[PDB]
């Protein structure tokens, strides 16, 4: 395992295990899907935009 | 005050750079000040020729400098009397044994910079703005084209209060990348200040 952080890896491990476990026996997909271990979590650090302190978090405006 | 440059917005796509060449962090700036100075003289000189674009390529001390013009005549000169002066005048500024082509513009009425210059001139000639605009669009819209548009800045007819006249035809979908809209700006000095002409010519599609 490489890249990221230990909790990200923990989920990566979660994929391989279920992905290999399927190649081994394809009849295993039918039980893994219901709990979707076969899905790749697409949630990823959203980019930082300009004008914003950090993507969404906007600066604070005073007595407008 | 919005809207990005149509060219800058379409560089990676329908529209290529006017300078192709790799450099390192040590020469890039130099091969720019110069590369720019090339456009500096050529612009002041080959004016009457009506120079649309001024591509420039480079290599190990090599230079392309392909100059695109409507009337290549004024460029070259008597047999070749001028394209020699302005090449020796060129290589004088930059000792790089520089080439120097002279491409010809097929129908200058599809060359936004030209169309702009045209309208710009007419304005310094105390002409009627609205007309030129309507004409310009026509000339361009007639020489084929799937759309066209022209925008003269303000202070129209020396009128105290600046305005903005434009008018256009066909399509000019500035938001679509897969378009190809030659854009061309031309200034217009006067007795009562500057004016800014802008030109758009929607040529192709995919």
């Amino acid at each position: 395992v490489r890249g990221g952080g230990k909790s990200g890896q923990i989920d990566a491990i979660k994929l391989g295990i279920a992905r290999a476990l399927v190649q081994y026996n394809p009849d295993y997909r039918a039980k893994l899907k219901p709990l979707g271990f076969l899905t790749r979590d697409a949630r990823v650090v959203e980019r930082k935009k300009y004008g914003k302190h950090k993507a969404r978090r906007a600066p604070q405006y005073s007595k407008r | 005050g919005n809207k990005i440059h149509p060219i800058g917005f379409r560089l990676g796509i329908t529209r290529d750079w006017e300078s192709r060449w790799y450099a390192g962090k040590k020469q890039y700036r130099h091969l720019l000040l110069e590369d720019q100075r090339i456009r500096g003289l050529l612009e002041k000189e080959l004016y009457s020729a009506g120079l649309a674009r001024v591509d420039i390529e480079r290599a190990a001390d090599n230079v392309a400098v392909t100059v695109h013009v409507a009337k290549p005549g004024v460029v070259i000169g008597r047999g070749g009397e001028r394209i020699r002066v302005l090449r020796e005048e060129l290589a004088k500024l930059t000792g790089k044994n520089v080439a120097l082509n002279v491409q010809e513009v097929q129908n200058p009425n599809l060359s936004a910079p030209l169309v702009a210059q045209r309208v710009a001139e007419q304005i310094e000639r105390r002409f009627a703005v609205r007309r030129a605009i309507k004409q310009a669009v026509q000339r361009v819209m007639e020489s084929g084209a799937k759309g066209a548009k022209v925008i003269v800045s303000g202070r129209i007819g020396g009128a105290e209060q600046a305005r903005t006249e434009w008018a256009a035809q066909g399509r000019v979908p500035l938001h679509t990348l897969r378009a190809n809209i030659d854009y061309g700006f031309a200034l217009a000095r006067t007795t009562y200040g500057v004016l800014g002409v802008k030109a758009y010519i929607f040529l192709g599609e995919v």
């Binding site: 980019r47 | 990005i4 440059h5 560089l11 290529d16 006017e18 790799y22 890039y28 700036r29 720019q36």
Partner: protein
């Protein structure tokens, strides 16, 4: 950006800690990049034109 100050080119500072980039295109002396010798403004302009090889509109 009074010509008298675009003398910067001197390179005859008498003390090198007096040198100072200064945009080659607009004389700008306040937001001049190194890699271009151009200020933040001039850079935006020519970049749009496409007179800066490679320099494209960044997005991601």
């Amino acid at each position: 950006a009074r010509k008298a100050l675009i003398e910067k080119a001197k390179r005859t500072p008498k003390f090198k800690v007096r040198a100072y980039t200064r945009c080659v295109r607009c004389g700008r002396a306040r937001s001049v990049y190194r890699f271009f010798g151009l200020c933040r403004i001039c850079l935006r302009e020519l970049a749009h034109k496409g007179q800066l090889p490679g320099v494209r509109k960044a997005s991601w």
